[PDB]
Design an enzyme around this catalytic site. Structure first.
Site, PDB file in Angstrom:
ATOM      1  N   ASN A  14       0.841  -1.189   0.000  1.00 13.08           N
ATOM      2  CA  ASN A  14       0.000   0.000   0.000  1.00 13.08           C
ATOM      3  C   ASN A  14       0.887   1.255   0.000  1.00 13.08           C
ATOM      4  O   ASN A  14       1.585   1.534   0.987  1.00 13.08           O
ATOM      5  CB  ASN A  14      -0.945  -0.005   1.207  1.00 13.08           C
ATOM      6  CG  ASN A  14      -1.776   1.271   1.306  1.00 13.08           C
ATOM      7  OD1 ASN A  14      -2.813   1.413   0.651  1.00 13.08           O
ATOM      8  ND2 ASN A  14      -1.313   2.216   2.126  1.00 13.08           N
ATOM      9  N   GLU A  15       0.888   1.978  -1.120  1.00 15.09           N
ATOM     10  CA  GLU A  15       1.576   3.282  -1.240  1.00 15.09           C
ATOM     11  C   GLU A  15       3.101   3.249  -0.983  1.00 15.09           C
ATOM     12  O   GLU A  15       3.656   4.148  -0.363  1.00 15.09           O
ATOM     13  CB  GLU A  15       0.905   4.329  -0.316  1.00 15.09           C
ATOM     14  CG  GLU A  15      -0.596   4.538  -0.651  1.00 15.09           C
ATOM     15  CD  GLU A  15      -1.251   5.663   0.132  1.00 15.09           C
ATOM     16  OE1 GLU A  15      -0.642   6.099   1.121  1.00 15.09           O
ATOM     17  OE2 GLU A  15      -2.380   6.102  -0.254  1.00 15.09           O
ATOM     18  N   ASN A  56      -5.325   4.617  -4.782  1.00 17.54           N
ATOM     19  CA  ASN A  56      -5.953   5.358  -3.700  1.00 17.54           C
ATOM     20  C   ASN A  56      -6.174   6.765  -4.223  1.00 17.54           C
ATOM     21  O   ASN A  56      -5.196   7.471  -4.489  1.00 17.54           O
ATOM     22  CB  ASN A  56      -5.045   5.350  -2.446  1.00 17.54           C
ATOM     23  CG  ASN A  56      -4.791   3.938  -1.926  1.00 17.54           C
ATOM     24  OD1 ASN A  56      -5.584   3.036  -2.181  1.00 17.54           O
ATOM     25  ND2 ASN A  56      -3.697   3.748  -1.170  1.00 17.54           N
ATOM     26  N   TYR A  74      -8.301  15.788  -1.182  1.00 19.63           N
ATOM     27  CA  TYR A  74      -6.943  16.276  -0.985  1.00 19.63           C
ATOM     28  C   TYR A  74      -6.559  17.227  -2.134  1.00 19.63           C
ATOM     29  O   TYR A  74      -5.411  17.292  -2.544  1.00 19.63           O
ATOM     30  CB  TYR A  74      -5.932  15.127  -0.887  1.00 19.63           C
ATOM     31  CG  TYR A  74      -5.873  14.410   0.466  1.00 19.63           C
ATOM     32  CD1 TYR A  74      -5.840  13.015   0.531  1.00 19.63           C
ATOM     33  CD2 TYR A  74      -5.807  15.123   1.662  1.00 19.63           C
ATOM     34  CE1 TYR A  74      -5.764  12.343   1.757  1.00 19.63           C
ATOM     35  CE2 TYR A  74      -5.736  14.458   2.895  1.00 19.63           C
ATOM     36  CZ  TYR A  74      -5.721  13.062   2.923  1.00 19.63           C
ATOM     37  OH  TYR A  74      -5.655  12.375   4.118  1.00 19.63           O
ATOM     38  N   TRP A  90     -12.709   4.439   1.508  1.00 22.39           N
ATOM     39  CA  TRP A  90     -11.894   4.702   2.692  1.00 22.39           C
ATOM     40  C   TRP A  90     -12.663   5.729   3.515  1.00 22.39           C
ATOM     41  O   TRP A  90     -12.743   6.881   3.097  1.00 22.39           O
ATOM     42  CB  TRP A  90     -10.523   5.247   2.282  1.00 22.39           C
ATOM     43  CG  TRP A  90      -9.545   5.222   3.412  1.00 22.39           C
ATOM     44  CD1 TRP A  90      -9.104   6.295   4.146  1.00 22.39           C
ATOM     45  CD2 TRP A  90      -8.882   4.062   3.945  1.00 22.39           C
ATOM     46  NE1 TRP A  90      -8.202   5.866   5.109  1.00 22.39           N
ATOM     47  CE2 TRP A  90      -8.043   4.505   4.998  1.00 22.39           C
ATOM     48  CE3 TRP A  90      -8.908   2.698   3.626  1.00 22.39           C
ATOM     49  CZ2 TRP A  90      -7.230   3.624   5.736  1.00 22.39           C
ATOM     50  CZ3 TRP A  90      -8.100   1.807   4.367  1.00 22.39           C
ATOM     51  CH2 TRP A  90      -7.273   2.280   5.405  1.00 22.39           C
TER      52      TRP A  90
HETATM   53  O1  LIG Z   1      -5.081   9.905   3.960  1.00 19.17           O
HETATM   54  C1  LIG Z   1      -5.841   8.852   4.172  1.00 19.17           C
HETATM   55  O2  LIG Z   1      -6.842   8.961   4.857  1.00 19.17           O
HETATM   56  C2  LIG Z   1      -5.430   7.534   3.593  1.00 19.17           C
HETATM   57  C3  LIG Z   1      -4.452   7.742   2.445  1.00 19.17           C
HETATM   58  N1  LIG Z   1      -4.049   6.420   1.959  1.00 19.17           N
HETATM   59  C4  LIG Z   1      -3.510   5.447   2.896  1.00 19.17           C
HETATM   60  C5  LIG Z   1      -4.399   5.322   4.138  1.00 19.17           C
HETATM   61  O3  LIG Z   1      -3.765   4.515   5.151  1.00 19.17           O
HETATM   62  C6  LIG Z   1      -4.709   6.722   4.677  1.00 19.17           C
HETATM   63  O4  LIG Z   1      -5.499   6.624   5.862  1.00 19.17           O
END
Ligand SMILES: O=C(O)[C@H]1CNC[C@@H](O)[C@@H]1O
Ligand SMILES: O=C(O)[C@H]1CNC[C@@H](O)[C@@H]1O
Lengths: 655, 655
Positions: free
Chosen positions: A393-394, A442, A448, A527
């Site tokens: 992840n990332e 993501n 953002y 998310w």
């Molecule tokens: O910024 C966020 O809320 C997410 C961004 N991508 C990874 C997640 O763990 C993170 O919580």
């Protein structure tokens, strides 16, 4: 005669090693020592050693049996001692582990069990970084397992010792290879191995084999199964599973047994048409879920897993990404039971917008990452719900470049389990996206920065440029406090102390419309299903919280977006929900009211007087504009059609 | 023309004075800065100065009006500044306060409003000690009030400026004295004062008076009201209230108005027979409630008060002790609305089993205590629900002896309001018990030692020795964690880390039986309706919490005792509730199952097979003994009789 599984959760003596005097306090498992400090937003919450000690009576009648201590999870390093002598170490906070203590105990007396748990920072145990709390301690169950001296082995990465390998599955037939680990400490001789597949009381398969086991043997037996015209595990439509009993017999006596589920299915992911389960297209309406909760941290009880799943099913969730680490057996069991297609992943987590690195290029880190992957796959092998193995992840390429290591992990996943595809969740361009079989990103267009529209642009451009990629959305979301309300829609600063609920609602409505029109996207995952802990966060209505949940951290309150998804995803449960009820104070001259409903239309009433009916749009949304309020209290009601209607209501104040 | 009341809650700039640089962050009221640290069990949580600043546009059209800043609550000292010039101070964390800013502002521009709030320790502002958190900040609403230059005064201890004095009340007639404070800044002249009593659209009273008001006059007008054959406020049976409009008129124009409720009733407390409302005996089935909640501390929103009241009514509560301080206007409003007889009290709180003192014998402390009492009585005068004024909680005579001061407070209460009796909550023997009209004790027989039976002995002996006392129980309770469960009933150590839920259940069943048989006890109040914050606590399932609630701190989970009371107190809502469902793991050879129900009997089923019916006892409890479970999972179901029955169910594991 029967295998015993004894819970050792109650009444342990605890102290931190930084408490040097030696006095202790009672604790009860599941336990974390970070349920107060990390959850209060303390960024340097306690990360180091906590010690648990319990006197265990070893019954005289266990002599001749084999004894094992099995741990479901200890974050992140556990050193275990019996009568204060070291017996082993586990490195990794999310996989189960086991030690045999058969020849280490004194029978007929109390023996000391000591666990020294460490969640201090390390650079050789993923996850190294991450937007969540590294809660320390024995935060899952501890078991004493008691078996015959000849047993189905519990010693293979603490798995059940049985792998039901789905070689070929179709509606005409399924071929399964039952791989069974056997462990023998009896005198040289034989036993009969039986694999029995049933559907309730009906026998589907019964295969048997006589096996010769040397003293000290630890071996693998492989028994082929053939099931004609199988009933398939078919997601929420029919989450059907057979039960498999695997048993050992000596002289017509059963001496050991384990049970595992067999949920048969096949799948593929099409770069242009998305996910197909059992030959049929299936949109994956997904969310993500972390394994913590208000007040208890990650020391979750069974009712917590049960409740989380109840809320997701209520919302019409049919897919889940259990981020960012191997989660509880019981949680994957509930996914199996309820038919939820599941992405399970290792904690190979990169920094995102934050500092440091997810990858440190040293043998100890890399070997430990491989161990956590093997743990994930072997321990959770038989869950039909799991349809993808997530590898990272990332991560990012700058500095220590993980591309070659991730290729090694991909090859290892395919070796350990050729029956499931690998996947990953990226926030990068470039070579990291081209390793796993499926890929996902993501995306926070409209949270953002930017606007939701650029998600549509990114998806279309990527799909056109790289037609071979199976594209998913592994995260998308926006923050909201239920205590932040404003009459007008205005995009907030993501990092600030003001996260009005209506922006999260707007964000999900706009992003969902983009996703709904693009079937080449094989799955999308909100998310997050729930607000969750991240001590370093300083945003929304309080520090220490990531507030992108559709539901609050204590699981008490569903945010408006929860009901938008419920109306669209859970169409066979009638409902109407008025949005913006928490926005009690109104000042706009022209009021807009909005409802989410499964009905084709709804009617609005203001102060007991109808404003007329409005049709639901294709996204189950009904909207009334230029509604006139009178100064002071107004009673707002919305109703579905029919003789027995559904209603939602709120009193707002206009000034 | 109309009085305006403008909420100033959103977007203030905040910093601690210990942050010396001057940069700030956005906050939104209600706000406390102690919602994370105190609630995490940090015993030295931040107690000191926090600063809030807001730019307020003073509209040109407000020129000629009068302007007031009214604060509903700031804990514990507030210094208020307009354009950074000091305008006043308030000392006391729970009473409202107000400053006129009419001649302090620049009209037609932004003016700075600065509030410097201090919750640092003091020895001259009650409460000095207490088993709860002294959450700092502006934790209730702030209002800008705008009135005519001739107005019903808001300047009398920040009260509504109207006291509806209930002189004589009976079913034949009620005599009320409407006391009205008038404030004039207009040129010398006259106005007409009108007091209008209504029941919906029906006019009950209309009394008028012409008044001559000098420039600068602040005077009291008294208008007698007579209501023939009144409809009485009669608790939950009929919480009826008239509405009173009090208005000022000049040249046939209304220029100001305020509304207050008029809920008429009479009462007395009989030393032998208990409480009588409107001439009829009324058992007071009471609970206590603190004004805080998980995650937000005491920064409660309206839905929090509403929910707390909904849970109490669900349980059949008809009386409440709003401990340990003046609470929100809106909360007393809900008590009025729902018919709940209410004990309201000042924060004159003693140490209990802890150190230091509730009373420090110095003029500043004593004068400030009198101010907080006058605030309580004048600010909350018109709430029919309030039937008792509480003067202290657990003071003691050793060291500084508060007896003579409490006599002064009693005389002051009777002067301020002869229409309600005084009461107090004691943990002492001796002279402190003989001052207030009613007396009550905080009793923990069966929790802090002893057995519930000694409560019965204490009540009977006290009643016999002192037949003139009106005896109540102002607190009784036991701790419970919903995560602490054991199959057997065993009394835990009160101060320890193990508070099994079944002991709290046992405690309340036994204590309730003692109370139910003793009608000379005029009221009893469970400590507490909800778990609540007390940073110094180190017991139960986590530090920082007093877990004697019938409901958890987040208001999410009702403990078993909640349903025992609900069955006994809320008899007209059909229900059945199986106790000990959270105790999932069973090991006792002989299982006992227990249900609380409004039905005359219920039926038990184990694994789908009936175990037969059992009768409910006089306390709505049904019990089945020697129930045989089989090894592993068992499904337990209980059902009421009838064609359409109610059921409760749980799966337990037996081993
Ligand atoms: O910024 C966020 O809320 C997410 C961004 N991508 C990874 C997640 O763990 C993170 O919580
Ligand atoms: O010990 C308790 O739980 C109670 C004892 N009496 C006073 C309360 O404030 C306190 O909370």
């Amino acid at each position: 005669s029967l295998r015993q599984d004894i819970l050792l959760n109650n009444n342990w003596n605890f102290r931190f090693s930084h408490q040097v005097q030696g006095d202790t306090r009672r604790v009860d498992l599941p336990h974390t020592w970070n349920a107060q400090d990390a959850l209060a937003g303390k960024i340097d919450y306690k990360r180091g050693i906590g010690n648990y000690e319990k006197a265990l009576y070893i019954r005289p009648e266990w002599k001749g049996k084999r004894l094992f201590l099995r741990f479901d999870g200890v974050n992140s390093i556990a050193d275990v001692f019996i009568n204060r002598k070291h017996i082993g170490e586990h490195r990794g906070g999310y996989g189960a582990f086991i030690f045999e203590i058969t020849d280490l105990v004194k029978y007929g007396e109390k023996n000391s069990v000591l666990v020294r748990a460490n969640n201090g920072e390390q650079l050789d145990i993923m996850p190294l970084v991450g937007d969540f709390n590294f809660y320390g301690g024995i935060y899952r169950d501890v078991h004493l397992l008691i078996t015959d001296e000849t047993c189905i082995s519990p010693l293979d990465y603490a798995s059940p010792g049985v792998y039901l390998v789905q070689e070929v599955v179709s509606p005409q037939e399924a071929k399964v290879c039952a791989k069974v680990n056997l462990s023998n400490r009896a005198a040289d001789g034989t036993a009969e191995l039986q694999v029995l597949v049933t559907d309730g009381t009906k026998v589907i398969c019964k295969e048997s084999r006589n096996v010769s086991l040397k003293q000290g043997a630890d071996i693998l037996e492989q028994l082929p199964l053939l099931i004609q015209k199988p009933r398939l595990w078919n997601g929420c439509e029919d989450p059907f599973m057979y039960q498999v009993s695997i048993s050992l017999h000596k002289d017509g006596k059963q001496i050991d047994s384990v049970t595992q589920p067999l949920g048969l299915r096949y799948y593929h992911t099409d770069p242009d048409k998305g996910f197909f389960l059992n030959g049929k297209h299936l949109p994956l309406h997904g969310v993500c879920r972390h394994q913590d909760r208000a007040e208890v941290g990650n020391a979750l009880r069974p009712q917590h897993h049960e409740e989380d799943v109840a809320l997701m099913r209520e919302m019409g969730v049919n897919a889940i990404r259990l981020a960012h680490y191997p989660q509880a057996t019981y949680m994957y069991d509930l996914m199996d039971k309820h038919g939820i297609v599941t992405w399970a992943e290792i904690p190979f987590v990169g920094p995102g917008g934050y500092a440091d690195k997810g990858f440190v290029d040293q043998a100890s880190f890399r070997e430990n990452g491989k161990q956590q992957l093997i743990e994930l796959i072997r321990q959770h092998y038989n869950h039909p719900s799991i349809c993808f193995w997530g590898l990272f992840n990332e991560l990012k390429e700058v500095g220590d470049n993980p591309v070659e290591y991730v290729k090694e992990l991909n090859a290892l996943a395919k070796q350990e389990d050729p029956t499931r595809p690998t996947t990953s969740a990226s926030n990068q361009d470039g070579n990291l996206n081209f390793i796993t079989e499926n890929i996902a990103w993501n995306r926070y267009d409209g949270w953002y920065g930017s606007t939701p529209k650029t998600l549509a642009t990114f998806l279309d451009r990527t799909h056109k440029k790289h037609p071979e990629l199976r594209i998913g959305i592994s995260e998308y979301g926006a923050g909201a406090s239920i205590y932040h309300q404003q009459d007008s829609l205005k995009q907030p600063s993501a990092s600030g102390w003001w996260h009005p609920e209506n922006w999260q609602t707007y964000y999900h409505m706009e992003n969902w419309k983009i996703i709904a029109e693009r079937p080449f996207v094989w799955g999308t995952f909100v998310w997050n299903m729930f607000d969750f802990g991240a001590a370093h966060r300083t945003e929304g209505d309080r520090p220490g919280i990531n507030d992108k949940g559709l539901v609050t951290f204590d699981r008490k309150v569903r945010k408006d977006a929860f009901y938008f998804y419920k109306a669209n995803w859970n169409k066979q449960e009638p409902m109407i929900y008025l949005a913006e009820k928490r926005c009690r104070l109104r000042y706009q001259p022209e009021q807009t009211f909005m409802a989410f409903t499964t009905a084709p239309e709804a009617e609005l009433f203001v102060n007991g007087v109808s404003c007329g009916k409005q049709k639901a749009d294709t996204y189950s949304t009904v909207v009334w504009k230029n509604v006139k309020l009178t100064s002071g209290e107004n009673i707002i009601r919305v109703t579905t059609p029919g003789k027995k209607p559904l209603t939602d209501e709120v009193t707002v104040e206009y000034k």
